[model samples]
Target: QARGLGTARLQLVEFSAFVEPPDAVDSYQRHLFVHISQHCPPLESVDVRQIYDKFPEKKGGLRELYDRGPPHAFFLVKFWADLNWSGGFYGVSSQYESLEHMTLTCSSKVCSFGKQVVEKVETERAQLEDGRFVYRLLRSPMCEYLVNFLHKLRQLPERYMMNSVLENFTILQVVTNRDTQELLLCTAYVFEVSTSERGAQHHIYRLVR
Candidate 1:
C-alpha cells in the first residue's frame, strides 16, 4: 500500500535523524523517560540528571528499582528479545542513579513478585484474549504492591530497541491511578515484526475496581 510504504519511510527518516548529533543521547534518553512515564507512573518522578550525577560511570539507563522499605522487593527491567508476558510487563525503566539512592541494594536478579500475586495475575490473564489487557488493579495493599512492583518491571532501560522487530509478545501500555490504586495494561500479539498491515493486532483487558 502507498500509505504503508509512506509511513515506513517517514519512520526510517525520523529514527535516523533522532540518533544523529551531540544531543542524540540526551534527547533520546529524555524521550524514552517520557515514554516510560506515560506507561508507568511510579517512575515518572525519577530524575535523569540526578541519576546521571549519582553514577556517572554507569553510562546507561535504569536497569532496576531497589526499594529500601519493607517487603524487601526489587524489580528489574531488561530489554529482552522475547515476546509474551515476559517481554517487559507494560513498559521499561531505563535509568540507574535515582534507583541507586532509593534502595538498600541492587542486582540484576533481585526482580520478583510474591507467588500469590503471580498466581492471581496469571489466573486473571488467562481469562483475557491475546492482545492488550487494560485492567484496573484493585485498591488494596496487595494490589498496590503488585502495581508498583510491576511498574518497575515494565520500566526498562533506554537501550531497548522499540521496534516490532525486537519486541513480539508483551504488554505495550500500563497506566495507574495513585488515588484509587487502579492499574491498566495493554498487550500486543503480532504475527510478524511489522506493526503495519496484517502483521499485528492488540488485545486489551481491564480489571474491575
Candidate 2:
C-alpha cells in the first residue's frame, strides 16, 4: 500500500536493555483479544477482570496478520503496558508484529491475588486513583517477589501493601513498538500509600510467619 515504502513496511522491530524480550511470535494472546476490540488500533477501554476473571486459562506474546495477499499486508495498532507488545494475522501487515498495545489487563488482574509486600521500589507515579489497585502491576518485573506473591495467597488474601515504589509507564512507549519484541518497561504506575487498614483474618498468615 501507500505506507509500505513499497514503504508501508513499518513492521514492528525489537529492541531491549533488560531481560531479552520475547519475539512477536506465538505468545497465545489471540485467546484474549478474541474477547475484545483487540486486533485493531484504538483506545479500546475494557475491564480485563470481566474477561479473564471468567475464563481461567491463557498465555500471550505474538501478533496476527489479517488474511490477504501473502506478498503484502496492512496495519492498525493499539498499544499496551510494560514496554512489550504483539500482533495479529500475517503480511507486510503488522498483525502479531503490531501487537503493540493492550492485553496486560487480563494478565495483571489474573495475577492480582491476596496481600503482597515489597521493598526499595522506584517508579514515576507511585500514587494511584480510586481504582488504584489496578495500578499495582501492569508491566514491571523488577518486583518479581512482590507481584508473584499475589498469586500465592490470592485464594483469600484480600489486602495489599506497598512502599518506596515509584513512576509507572506509558508514552515513553507511545511513540514506540513492541509488537516486534518483548519490552520490560517498569510497572505501569506509582503504587504508593502510607498504608490502609483492612480487616482480613489471614492478615499475618503470609507475613512474618
Candidate 3:
C-alpha cells in the first residue's frame, strides 16, 4: 500500500553560540548554511546576536576553543544533513584562537545562554513537542540519552566518552516511534529552540546519508 506524507525538517528561529574552525571562516559559514538548507531538509532563518555580542567584529580576528577555551562567540542555524546526520551549523566571527575558550554549558551558573538547566527542565520537555522522546546535550559528563542517540547514529556502544576524531559534531535529534514503519522522508523546517529564560538556537535534523 502507498501513503501520502506528514511533516519533516526541524524548525528553528534563532541560535547563538560558537564554532571551531580548522578551515577558513568562509568555509565555516557556508557549511552552516548548507547544513541547515540542504541536509536538514527544511529551513527558515536564524538570528545570531550572541555572536556579535561576544566577538563584536573586532578586526575580524579568529579564535579557537578546546585547548584554551578562548572568549569568542559563534551563532548558528539548524538544518538537516545527509539524512543520517542531525544538527545545524553556525556562522562564527572571531579571531584565530581555538575552540577551547568556549564552554557548551546549559545551566544558568555555567553557560553564556544564562539558562539554568534545572530551571529550564520544563522548557526542555516542551522543546520535544512530541511529548515522547527526550532531548539531551552532548558534552563531557555525557548524558545517557545522548549516549543512546550516539549509539544509533554511529552504531557504537551506548555508553562512552567524548571522541573528537570519531565524532563529527553534536546534534539534538528527535526520537520517536510514531511512523517508524514508514521510510521517514526529508523534513521541511529546522526547529528554533530555546530555554525559557534565554534566546533561541537553531536545531536542525538530518538523516544519515
Candidate 4:
C-alpha cells in the first residue's frame, strides 16, 4: 500500500484581466530556464529544457509542457512534502523531513531522479494563450523527493520569498517505498521545476521547521 500522501492544494487563484503582454511569457521562459536551472547544483548542470529528451515518455510519459512557455501545467507537478499539507502553499515541513530521514533507503543522504503529475481544473485566462496551475500523482517509480525538494527550494515567484534558515533541498532522489509493506526499488529522474503566477506573492506561507 502507498504511504500517507496525495491531496491536491485547496486553493488555485483565478485571474481575470491580467498577465503581462505575450512577449512577457517569452522572456519569462528564457529567464525562467536560467533562473531555475541556475539553482541546480554545480554537480549537475540542470537544464529544465532537456527533461523531455532525457526521459521522453519514459514510464509515466507526460508531454513536456514548457515549450513556448505554458508553465501552469508544468507548475502542476506537486512536491512530496506538499502532499501532506493543504494546497495554496509550497515548501517542505519538518514532519516530512523526518519521514525521509527515517524511511527512504536512498543512495547517499536522500533519494534522487524523481518527479510528479497533478490534476488541474479550469484555471486559465487565455486570449488564445494564458494558462492555469494544477497536478496529479501517477504510478510513479519514485516518491518524488526532488519535486518536494525543489518546492521548498529556497526559491521564487516574480517575488520569491526565502526563510532566515535556507531549507535543505536536493533536486534528485532514487526511492524505494520504505513507507509501504514491501520494499520496491525504483530509480527516479533528475529534473528541476519552478513556475508560479498570481498566487506566488499571495502564498508566501511557510511551516516551522
Q: All models: lDDT?
A: 0.21, 0.21, 0.25, 0.24
**Per-residue lDDT of 119-179 in model 3, one digit per residue for the tens?**
1111122222243232333212333343344335444332132222123332221212233
Report the C-alpha lDDT of model 2 over 119-198, residue by residue, as the tens digit.
33222212333332111222234345433332332333322322211212111111112233323221111122212232
Model 1, 120-140: lDDT tens digits are 221111112233222222211
Q: What ranges in model 1 sit over 4 Å off?
A: 1-169, 184-191, 194-209
RMSD of 3: 21.2
- For residues 67-129, what per-residue lDDT tens digits would candidate 4 score against the true structure? 322222122121212111112212221111111222333321232222232211111111211
Candidate 4: where is the Cα deviation over 4 Å? 1-102, 107-172, 177-197, 200-209
Error of 2 at 127 (Å): 38
- Residue 55 local lDDT, model 1: 19
Q: Top lDDT: which candidate number? A: 3
Please provide TM-scores, in order, for all candidate models, with all chains considered together.
0.18, 0.17, 0.18, 0.19
Which 10-residue window in model 3 sums to the lowest lDDT? 94-103
Which order, best to worst by lDDT?
3, 4, 2, 1
True-structure RMSD, every candidate:
20.2, 20.6, 21.2, 18.9
- Name the candidate that leads on TM-score: 4
